[PDB]
Design an enzyme around this catalytic site. Structure first.
Site, PDB file in Angstrom:
ATOM      1  N   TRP A   9       0.847  -1.192   0.000  1.00  0.00           N
ATOM      2  CA  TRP A   9       0.000   0.000   0.000  1.00  0.00           C
ATOM      3  C   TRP A   9       0.874   1.230   0.000  1.00  0.00           C
ATOM      4  CZ3 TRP A   9      -2.228   2.757   4.747  1.00  0.00           C
ATOM      5  CH2 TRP A   9      -3.287   3.600   4.378  1.00  0.00           C
ATOM      6  N   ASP A  49      -1.401  -5.226   9.590  1.00  0.00           N
ATOM      7  CA  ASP A  49      -2.347  -4.253   9.044  1.00  0.00           C
ATOM      8  C   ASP A  49      -3.559  -5.029   8.548  1.00  0.00           C
ATOM      9  OD1 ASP A  49      -3.808  -2.509   7.464  1.00  0.00           O
ATOM     10  OD2 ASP A  49      -1.995  -1.527   6.663  1.00  0.00           O
ATOM     11  N   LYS A  68     -13.968  -0.655   5.356  1.00  0.00           N
ATOM     12  CA  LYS A  68     -14.382  -1.518   4.263  1.00  0.00           C
ATOM     13  C   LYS A  68     -15.456  -2.493   4.719  1.00  0.00           C
ATOM     14  CE  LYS A  68     -11.466   0.782   2.243  1.00  0.00           C
ATOM     15  NZ  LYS A  68     -10.104   0.819   1.689  1.00  0.00           N
TER      16      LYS A  68
END
Ligand SMILES: Cc1ncc(COP(=O)(O)O)c(C=O)c1O
Length: 405
Positions: free
Chosen positions: A127, A209, A245
């Site tokens: 990311w 993460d 999300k």
């Protein structure tokens, strides 16, 4: 680290009627609209009718019920770490805020005092905001571990392990818990064991993460297997959680930094230091998002409805992967396309080169990243044929090398 958001801005301003946003990882329905999850509409209504709620400051570290619920979701209800009271949770401004607070902690109190030289290892590729967040915390030596093998389009497990074996003791390792961004390829459980083994031998610090729990398998429990394995192997560690999300709560900024320690005293100390870092950053966290998640996860009925909503998203993604691969294959697009359906989570790392992306963006108004990453949840039964035919054009017209072909 703001490429996806600029991509969204360019897409909104584009007047072309054919346009499709395959950039940012944000879920869309089959009619290409935002989906506020049913469980979230219901809990919002309950909040809006609950007149005992006030707006007084939450504690610095945040809403107690939310923090417990979030850590439980990561670790499991029967986690020994919960039972032994060696787990802490810091409510944060989404996953990004959890990573940043965790980073600032490590940069001040870990591996000595104010040690900015501790290597931080991120995946190759990863990311965009990982390097940027850890640099902002002041870390001077940010490094890559091999992950993606672009030839075999899977994991370079030997590279990964070798890079970890050669990392200085106490290095920080940023591990995607599931649903790797951007590759959509995760280690298998057996592979995770080998990774953990190398981390244990070299005293490396796992910083998980977890931004997509639920999207790798459709099943929340299964997607946390790796977190839970590291608990069982005796690691202390951080796990930055996002509910942007899996609750679709992007703009309410709901995250949690889970901390797993050896003993309760470890956690009390870490948390008291986190309080100072939060105070000088945002002071204390916002309530609305946290209250929605706390209410959902603390109630057995709403929890079950929620997991059904997550399953709905994960299933739609599976279908879009199958359909895209099928249409590319029926068009006789060169190369193989099973990686579209092998990969998991929200994205596919398609393998398109930067000129092929440029064509898609500028000629066809299909927005994706220069890396070839697409958001699979951006595809729909109405845009699939346009996206497939456009990819076909790009693959057949734009060679890897202009000369010698
Ligand atoms: C790997 C990864 N980590 C962290 C985040 C940050 O998420 P958030 O919007 O909740 O800050 C994202 C995006 O969802 C992500 O893809």
């Amino acid at each position: 680290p703001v490429l996806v958001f600029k991509l969204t801005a360019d897409f909104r301003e584009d007047p072309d009627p054919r346009k499709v946003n395959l950039g940012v990882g944000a879920y869309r329905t089959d009619d290409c609209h935002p989906w506020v999850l049913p469980v979230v509409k219901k809990v919002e209504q309950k909040i809006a009718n609950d007149n005992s709620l006030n707006h007084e400051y939450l504690p610095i570290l945040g809403l107690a019920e939310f923090r417990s619920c979030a850590s439980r979701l990561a670790l499991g209800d029967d986690s020994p770490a919960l039972k032994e009271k060696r787990v802490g949770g810091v409510q944060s401004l989404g996953g990004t805020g959890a990573l940043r607070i965790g980073a600032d902690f490590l940069a001040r109190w870990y591996n000595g005092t104010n040690n900015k030289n501790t290597p931080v290892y991120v995946s190759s590729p990863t990311w965009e905001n990982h390097n940027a967040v850890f640099s902002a915390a002041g870390f001077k030596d940010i490094r890559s571990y091999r992950y993606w093998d672009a030839e075999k389009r899977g994991l370079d497990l030997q590279g990964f392990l070798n890079d970890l074996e050669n990392a200085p003791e106490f290095s920080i390792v940023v591990l995607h818990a599931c649903a790797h961004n951007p590759t959509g390829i995760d280690p298998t459980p057996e592979q995770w064991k080998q990774i953990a083994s190398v981390m244990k031998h070299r005293f490396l610090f796992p910083f998980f993460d977890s931004a997509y729990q639920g999207f790798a398998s459709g099943n929340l429990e299964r997607d946390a297997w790796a977190i839970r394995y590291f608990v069982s192997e005796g690691f202390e560690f951080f796990c930055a959680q996002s509910f942007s999300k899996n609750f679709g709560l992007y703009n309410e900024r709901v995250g949690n930094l889970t901390v797993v320690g050896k003993e309760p005293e470890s956690i009390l100390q870490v948390l008291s230091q986190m309080e100072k870092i939060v105070r000088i950053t945002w002071s204390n966290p916002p309530a609305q998002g946290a209250r929605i998640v706390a209410s959902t996860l603390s109630n057995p009925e709403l929890f079950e409805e929620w997991t059904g909503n997550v399953k709905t998203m994960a299933d739609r993604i599976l279908t879009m992967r199958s359909e895209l691969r099928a249409r590319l294959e029926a068009l006789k697009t060169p190369g193989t396309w099973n990686h579209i359906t092998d990969q998991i989570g929200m994205f596919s790392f398609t393998g398109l080169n930067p000129k092929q992306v440029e064509y898609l963006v500028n000629e066809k108004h299909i927005y994706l990243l220069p890396s070839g990453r697409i958001n699979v949840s951006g595809l729909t039964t109405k845009n699939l044929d346009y996206v497939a035919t456009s990819i076909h054009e790009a693959v057949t017209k734009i060679a890897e090398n202009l000369y010698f072909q």
